[PDB]
Amino acid sequence: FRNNYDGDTVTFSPTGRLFQVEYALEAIKQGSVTVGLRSNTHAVLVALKRNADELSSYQKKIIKCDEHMGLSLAGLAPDARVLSNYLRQQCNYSSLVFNRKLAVERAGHLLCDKAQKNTQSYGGRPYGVGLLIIGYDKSGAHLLEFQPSGNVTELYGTAIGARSQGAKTYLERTLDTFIKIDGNPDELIKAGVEAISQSLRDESLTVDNLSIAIVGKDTPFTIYDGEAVAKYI
Amino acid sequence: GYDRALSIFSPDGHIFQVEYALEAVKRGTCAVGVKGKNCVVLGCERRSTLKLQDTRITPSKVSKIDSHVVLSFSGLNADSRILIEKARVEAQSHRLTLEDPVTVEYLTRYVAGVQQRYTQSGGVRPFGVSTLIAGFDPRDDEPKLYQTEPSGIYSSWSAQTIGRNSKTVREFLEKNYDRKEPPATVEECVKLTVRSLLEVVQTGAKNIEITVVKPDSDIVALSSEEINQYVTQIEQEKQEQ
């Protein structure tokens, strides 16, 4: 049942389960929390950065993919680099060949298909990273959740990582209010920073803790770190 | 076709295959290198098991890589041949492109690099060989001696030994080698090299072989009659109180 059935990504368990993929999912829960949510005009990523030491830098959780698209990571960081690189390329291909900004939904489909091939190949391993992808395209604001299983779902809001269940219950509660925060970036960011709070056995979140990203109608995807997030604590 | 990984990490942090490659070196015949003021000497032991050999034609342990650099080894004899050949090719290639023979450090860095590469490639096993590389850089009188091991680590040694009972001869060399007073001549450097083997060989007849390297491509092998004279003089001189 669990014994001879988690050797590789190419074996089914007698229950119908793929254990390597479920173990890769467990690398996410181990990772530092991050939150994403959107109104009609903007989409926001908020991430708690983690330092491995008091003398070290807090490691980055937000990667930019195009002028209209970016993601936050939770899990194995090098994997996020691999997946964002591919995503940057797909965005690039779409611009150069078709002169078209890649739809956020297609970006989802593309990440899903890439993740899938690593759940069926021998001698490979699944990706061990979860991703939250935000974008503004020709149909407005979008937020996606990516799981290394290949499952990609479009949501109004979500959170992934350690203790993430707090923020997710909060957003599920705050739904009707934040969806309507249109034409106000700073209020939506406030609603996201306040959301990541429900996921803290940790402490106060400082000016190094904290990492925020925004994209929307007339805002290219931008990253705010350090000094520039002070006004939200 | 076959790239299945053989060399991997152990829970306590070692690479098991490398570590066993060293075990093969441990059981290989002893080799020793000591450097004089203006020379480097290389000695090796020969086993007793079979003694009906042909010494004219059997590959000796000290090999010329170029006309100024030599290589001795301990471990799997067959594995060593692959390293020596590659090293010889690299030497000719370095002369071709840089228009100058290799330094002894370069040649060591090259051999150690090949050794390392076999610890991290799929479907290959590491070399069961450790090496002593000795010689003189072109247009230089300052003597060189280096040692490599299956891992790919290398470094220089005033004197060193590898193979079975290398512990005993290293212990002998640590006592009898003075850095401020290194063996002043070829003759007195060869004598120290033989003394160190005599701790392990227990005989010394055609069981000890000695190669001497000097500045500017002067590399001579010693004959039985020339080694005998050293062996005889050592036990006779050192006996009384």
């Binding site: 007698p14 119908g16 899903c112 993740a115 021998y122 299983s149 290949g150 109004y156 957003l171 | -």
Partner: protein, 237 residues
Amino acid sequence: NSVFSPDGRNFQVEYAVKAVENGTTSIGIKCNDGVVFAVEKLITSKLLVPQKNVKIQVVDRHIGCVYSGLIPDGRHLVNRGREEAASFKKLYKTPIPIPAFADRLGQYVQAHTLYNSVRPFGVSTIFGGVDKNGAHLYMLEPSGSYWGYKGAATGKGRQSAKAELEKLVDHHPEGLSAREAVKQAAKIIYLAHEDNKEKDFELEISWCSLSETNGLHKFVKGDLLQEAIDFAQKEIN
């Protein structure tokens, strides 16, 4: 995978079926000139955007695909189906007939049960559309097995769906319209939801009818979707 048991079975394929059984329930209904596909979408949370996690996929212009099991595997199968359909049209000019397309998927899925280096697909796929000589509905198991169907269901609610599907074949032996079968698809999905009641669900319907869609695959939306939802809600009580 490439391992036969002593009694001639393939345990890995049998286990792959368990992954299918575990999944959402999806159905397909064959009507007198087209086909209807419907699927149950479990609403995990209010945070999921309604109407915006489309499960039903189009292949070429005239084929619809729905699947239950590991969703990513289904997408992998549809990508392949699309390559296989493009290739066919490139050489033969005509769009791929449905039986022709079924076999293309069939051989591909079977291939994934021949080699120790691969796992079988963790899906069952219901698919079909309108070609040169009528409407066709298929279902394809993880073993590569497939046959034609009058009606087909897979996933968690497969048994009650089959029971309802068996009843329709008995009451309408002479046909059954596209407009009717769309309604009926809404009903059967609602009934099959009984098993997954702990969470809310969203209904997705699509059809490919010769007279209603001009033999092209189209999503059921707006007034037609609402009317079918009503029928299902009204006939559940």
